[PDB]
Every structure is written in C-alpha cells, then in structure tokens.
Automatic annotation (TrEMBL), chain A:
GO terms for molecular function: structural constituent of ribosome. SUPFAM superfamilies: Ribosomal protein L30p/L7e. Residues 3-52 form the Large ribosomal subunit protein uL30-like ferredoxin-like fold domain. InterPro entries: Ribo_uL30_ferredoxin-like_sf, Ribosomal_uL30_bac-type, Ribosomal_uL30_ferredoxin-like. It holds the Pfam family Ribosomal_L30. It comes from the Bacteria. Belongs to the universal ribosomal protein uL30 family. GO terms for cellular component: cytosolic large ribosomal subunit. This is Large ribosomal subunit protein uL30. GO terms for biological process: translation. The keyword Ubl conjugation does not apply. The gene is rpmD. Part of the 50S ribosomal subunit. It comes from Pseudomonas aeruginosa.
TrEMBL record, chain B:
InterPro entries: Ribosomal_bL27, Ribosomal_bL27_CS. Keywords: Ribonucleoprotein, Ribosomal protein. One of its GO terms (biological process) is assembly of large subunit precursor of preribosome. Pfam families: Ribosomal_L27. GO terms for molecular function: ribosome binding; structural constituent of ribosome. The gene is rpmA. This is Large ribosomal subunit protein bL27. Belongs to the bacterial ribosomal protein bL27 family.
RNA sequence: GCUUGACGAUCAUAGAGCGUUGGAACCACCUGAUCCCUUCCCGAACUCAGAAGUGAAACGACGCAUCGCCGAUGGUAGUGUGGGGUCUCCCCAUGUGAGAGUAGGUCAUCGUCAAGC
RNA sequence: UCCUAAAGAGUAACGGAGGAGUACGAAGGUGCGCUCAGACCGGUCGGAAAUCGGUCGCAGAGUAUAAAGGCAAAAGCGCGCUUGACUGCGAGACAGACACGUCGAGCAGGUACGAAAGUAGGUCUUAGUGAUCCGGUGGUUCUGUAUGGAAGGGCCAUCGCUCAACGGAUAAAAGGUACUCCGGGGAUAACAGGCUGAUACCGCCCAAGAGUUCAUAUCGACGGCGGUGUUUGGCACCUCGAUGUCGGCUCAUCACAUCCUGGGGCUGAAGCCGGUCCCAAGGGUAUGGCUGUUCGCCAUUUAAAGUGGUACGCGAGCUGG
RNA sequence: GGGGCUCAAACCACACACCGAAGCUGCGGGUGUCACGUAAGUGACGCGGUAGAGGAGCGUUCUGUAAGCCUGUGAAGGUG
RNA sequence: ACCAAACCGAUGCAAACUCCGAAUACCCAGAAGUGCCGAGCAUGGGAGACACACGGCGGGUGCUAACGUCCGUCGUGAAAAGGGAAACAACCCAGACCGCCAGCUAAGGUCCCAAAGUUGUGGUUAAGUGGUAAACGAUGUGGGAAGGCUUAGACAGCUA
RNA sequence: AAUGGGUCAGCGACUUAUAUUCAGUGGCAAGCUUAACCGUAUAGGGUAGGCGUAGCGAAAGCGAGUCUUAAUAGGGCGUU
C-alpha cells in the first residue's frame, strides 16, 4: 500500500542508471525518508538500487 | 607480409526493429545478401535492402521451409 | 460419409529406411506420328491422334521404429548489480541462466473445393 | 572483405589476414529452354582421372573477380528478341560534421519481351575511384555593352590532364651545414635517476646420467621455480630559461654473494696440499711493460692481489690522453 | 608509522557498545530559482568548481548638474 | 615381416570455425510515481575544447613485463575540498553557501603516541607469524571423515 | 630538485576608426532614415541614396509563379 525508503549511502560514484532510480523514487540526500506507493513499477526502482537504501516497509 | 587497410564499415543491420510503426518507404533492414527475406508488404531492394511498401508495424516471423527469417509488415 | 484429386496452412515430434496394394474414377506408361511441333541427333523428352492394352516397375496413399528429429527435471558453465580475496583468477549476496548429456513421441496435425460411391 | 570489436550502430594500434584502380552489347533485361559436385566403374591406343552410357546421390558444386553474407521463385548455361545498361521524375527512409553517398513507384515519352497476371530504371550483394578552377565538343529558348548580328558569357549534355600526399597547397619543386642563427620542448632522443626484469647474474627443485663399483665426495643433460636490481634492453615518468663525458689522480663510504687471515661439516680428505659447503665483514687486499683506456694480454711479486652499490661514488677537488 | 604487544594490542567467527567528515540533524544567517502572495512573504528545492557563458556591483580621474555645496574655526594628501 | 589415404568408435582445441547459445546492452509501444520545476527537442547570440591522467572491468599489443602503449565501458582527478589508506591528483567514504566550545553516523577505528572496548563469549596460532615470497621440503600443531593391524596378545624394546 | 620574481615606489597589456550581425532599449511606422552640402550652425532644410512592402528562375521573363521535357502530366523555392 505504502512503503517508506531511506537513502543510506551516497549517489557520488554510483552508476547513472542507479541514481536515476533514487531521484525518481523521491530521494535527495542521505537519511531522507519518502513514503512510496507499493506499485511494482515503483518497487523495481527500490530493487535496482537496493544497496543504497533502507526499506522499513 | 604487410598488414593494414581495413575498410570503412558499412553500418549494416536491422534498423526499425520488430514492433515499430512504419511509413511506406522506410529502409527496414540493411543487409549483405538477404539474411532476412521479404514478407507481406516489404520490398527487397537491389543490394538486398528491405523496405516497407505499406504502413503498419513490422512483424519478423519465421515461416515456411528452408527456415527463412521473414520481415513482414502488418497494417495494424 | 470414405477413396482419390486440386492448389494451399505448418515446416526434418511432419524426415529418410525395410511389407501389402488401387483399377473405376483419378495417375504413370503404353500404340504411333499422319495432321501442331519437340530435337545442341530423339515422341523415354515433350507436342499429341488416342484409349488397342496395363497395374508390378512408375508414382500414390496405406504397413512396420533401428536411425535421424524433438527433449524434461535437476545440476553445471557463463553473467547484470553490490561487496570481498591469496586478484594473469575465483568467491559471497542477489537477479538471471545455458550448451552438451539424461525415460522416450512418432510411418505427423490442419483447411477449403469437387467429381464418384 | 573478415578478425580485433565486448550477440544494435560505431570503435584504435608501424595489430593479425587477404583484395581493388576492373570486367560484361551478354556475363543485362525479358521471353523461352534447362539443373550440381562426389564416390561407385566399363580397357584394343586416355586405363588416378575424358567422350558418356546408366546404378547408390543426400550442396560438399557453381557465382567474371578478394573475403564475408547469400541463394532453387535459382542469384549457372543454351537460344530467340534484338533493349528497361530507358527519359522526366520521385512519397519516404538509411547513412551522415560538411561535400559526398545508399535504397526506392505510379502517368507519359515510350518500350523489348510473355499469347497473359506481370517482371525489367543494369549485373547475387558490398571494391573497380577523383572535388573545384581552366580548357575541348554537341545542343539551346537564355544573354548578346547605340541598334541588327556575331564574339564572349550562362544553362543542359559530355571529354581531357592529374591531382594514388587519392577532401586534390603551385602550370611548374632537390640537397648540404662540423660555419651556422633564431623561436620553443623534457608533447621527444643521448648521460644520470625512476618503473619493469625479457636479458644478464646468483641460488634452488626433480635426477637421465659419469664418478672404474656408488644420482647426490665432486659434476649433472632434459625441464622446473625464485631472488638480486648487478647491464644489454623496454618505457618516456623527472631534468633541454643546461642535471657539463670515458679513464687516470686525490679522497673515500657501505654491502657480503669472502680474495687473505680466524672457526668448522663432508670428502673419491694417508700426509703435504686440495675439492666442495657452512659460519665469519675485524684488519689487510700489488708494482710495472703495452694501450686514452675500463678491461685485457704479459713480466715479476704477495699471506692475498675479492666481487658489487654509492649520478657506471667523487671535475664550485685535479687532470683533459 | 613508532613504542610496544603472546589465554594478545595477532588471526577466525558472533554479540553489544563507542569514537570518527565540511556527510546528516539541531540552531542563527541572502535571495539563487520557482510557485503562490490584489505583490510584505511565506513556502519548496538548490548554492565545490578550471576553461567558459550569464547577471550584479565597488573604487579612481575627467565633464554636466556646479557662479551650487564644503573649506583657512582648516581642503586634498599623509599617518593612526 | 613393411606399409596404406579413406571409413567405425573413443578423445581434445580456434580471434579470423558454429548444429547451438545467454546475462546484459540496444530499439519500440503502453503505464504509475518522481524530477526543482523542469528533464527532451528546435532556432538563434557567446564560447571554450580538439596533448588527458589513473583506477575497476572487457580485449589487442608486450613477456596475460612496465606509473608501457592502443581501443571499449565505467568511476575519479583534471575542474573537489573534508575523514580514512603513516606520508600518498587518480583508491575507500563523502560532494564544503556563511556561523556554533550542539548532537548522530560513513569509510576507518577503540593499549600508549592519538579521539573511542586493556569489551564479552568461543576457538586458533609461539613465528614477533601477524608485520613481504615460489617450486618444493619436514613426527610443528588444530579439526574432520575413513582404513588396515587391534589382548585368540600389534609398531619400536628380552633368555631356543 | 620544473618556470618567473632581491625588495619598495611609480609605470606597464582588449583600444580606436569604418563596415556589419545579434540582443536589449527607444523614435516613427507600411513605411523608415537621410549622405555630402546649405545653414544668423547640435536647430531647420537636403530624401540622391540605403533598407522594407514579392517572389521564383542562370537568364529573357512571368508574377502570388518559373524550370523540365513534344508534355498545363509528376516535385523544389515563395505566398494572406
């Protein structure tokens, strides 16, 4: 229904594809938390950048 | 006994891949000798260039004996 | 309704290989070239007057599974990303994932159309 | 044209492989006709093989030409017509910095062909090429320096010569400099440093073997694995608004992989001498004849005349062969 | 890296703490953009930077404003 | 007794071999959300650049040598400071608008130099291994599966 | 351990002319603006000229239309 992700690592040396998954998910800097809808087209951006994030649910 | 002198790399290949809308003149496969064959509305130019002769979308079927990889455009 | 025609869907699970046949319809021959012509010389090519003959060869469906051909599952190799290492190479997380090989189907499955029984 | 090239394009190297500077009036269009090569075998001139006659065939043939990719609806030959190897164009694409380049119908001029649906704007495809400016030629309706004309120019078609350093400096283009000059560079060589260690050097591992028997007292072919930075390289990282050679002289300083002296193990070490391997860097470790020499070769010594590093130590210490 | 460390101050696991950046948060600070605000007014996202593009300024000398204004009760200049 | 192409089976290996064949990448269409208020495109004004470096990966070249060199693709430095790697453009963490004698973390660390555990539980290692190294060589020690000889009396030690 | 600078104080490097293009800002507007020169002179006169209002074509030319070909048949450029 709603998931909330936090950005826990940086975007600096990351691939241009992966940081576009994090910007397109609503996130801006470290420890920023957004509330994300749990559509699978939204969840795929959570999975392509799984290592940069923390997904509380 | 002396190497050099490669050629200038003719840009062959499947342009306009197999789900795309076409107009009725589009070069559809650049080709070095009909690796792909001519389906319903496509044309087969002189150097074996496939070209759309009608509008629609390109299909890329495999059909028939001899294992022909066809390029046909369906008006959809 | 089946036999068989007539171009086609699908393309070696449909393919090749080893028996029985069909004569009425169809089909190949056959009898011969006179009247069309076919000949790099020829009526076996093919053009035909044909229907005296013939069902083996010719082909056709219709038999029979060795061989080709398809082919799991599971594993393995590879590999995108992230992180390691003893870093010309591999491992870990995660996503994906063959090729080859491993019981065996089968003498295929379809569609319209017609003369005959 | 293939590879490199990482399963879309593209993609470099003085990287690995080959080709082209054309052919074709049929080797094109079309009409028509028509489908390989292979083994298998029949000897009185060919006998591996031809003429090809017919049996199992299972693209392996052929394509004007390199290689790749393609083919039978043949994308090879025969033969007729004898021309679509058409004229005007051209929707739309592909390639693309630009100039270039590549692919592509319908109406007509009009067409070969087929009796016809229809196929044909060259060849199975991709090389077979060259801009502009000047000239040459044939058209033209255009221009035509007062006017009528011509000349010259323009447009359209086509030729040249030669740009192969092949986006082509000019119609026309070789050298020397140790007599040199300037502007720059450590974008770049020589010396030295640095990276690396093929190469050199020194250890080690298996042990065929010789050592008269006996692999290992000594030595070791075939191969193996390392160390040292010790020189021949390789690199071009520092240095070109300067880091001035080789050798001798003078002075050194460190290493130990030890030349002498000191302590030992083993010996194919009787002894005298040695061989070989450990341990050991305290101190010692020539003089001359030749040559610019380092070295080297020689004469005579010595207990011994060691091997390396130090910008191949040392020229604001010397010399200057 | 040094001192120094041997049931470790080493290595292998696991657990829990802590320290550590200009990161992040707290708190105070312009307008950079943008949306709103009949334009007081807050919001939101930013704000490392060479070549380079854009935008905004300060100060000097001269001319007009200036026959003004200041100045010998003290100019410019110099030093605090 | 020599030999003999081809054929049957077993068995390898190719950048210029392929009966096969991915992951990824690329092209396309449709969708939610996010975008700093835009990202994309088009025409104009002004540029600068057209000697890149190193690191990971995928290769050529070399000796699968070089901080060698040539490509592809990333990240960084160029043009990026701060913390870690002792010191160390290019590696790890992270991208500094200004102030604070506030607090949480990242990489990395917690005995002293030096900020934080002489922290807990369980093992290993005696070499200062840690804190440089290869073939190969050794009753160094920890753990684990198995085997043969095993009181009808084994392996090294006594009186036919 | 690449260049330059011993130091101080002065000086020392994107200017000017004429053509032109683009932007901003103005005046006039289907028009706009003058150049030499005249001028009791930054006024006023002077509209020669320049650009704009129409293009297409090599050109004659035709014009909201040519070229081409025997072809008003087929595309490029322009157009309230």
């Amino acid at each position: 229904a709603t998931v909330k992700v936090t950005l826990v690592k940086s975007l600096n040396g990351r691939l241009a594809n992966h940081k576009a998954c994090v910007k397109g998910l609503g996130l801006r800097r470290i420890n920023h938390t957004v509330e994300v809808q749990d559509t699978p087209e939204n969840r795929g951006m959570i999975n392509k950048a799984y290592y940069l994030l923390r997904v509380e649910g | 006994t002396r190497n050099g002198r490669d050629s200038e790399s003719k840009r062959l290949g499947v342009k306009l891949f197999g789900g795309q809308a076409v107009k009725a003149g589009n070069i559809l496969v650049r080709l070095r000798g009909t690796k792909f064959h001519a389906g319903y509305g496509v044309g087969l130019g002189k150097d074996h260039t496939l070209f759309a002769k009608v509008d629609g979308v390109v299909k890329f079927e495999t059909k028939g004996a001899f294992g022909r990889k066809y390029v046909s455009i369906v008006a959809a």
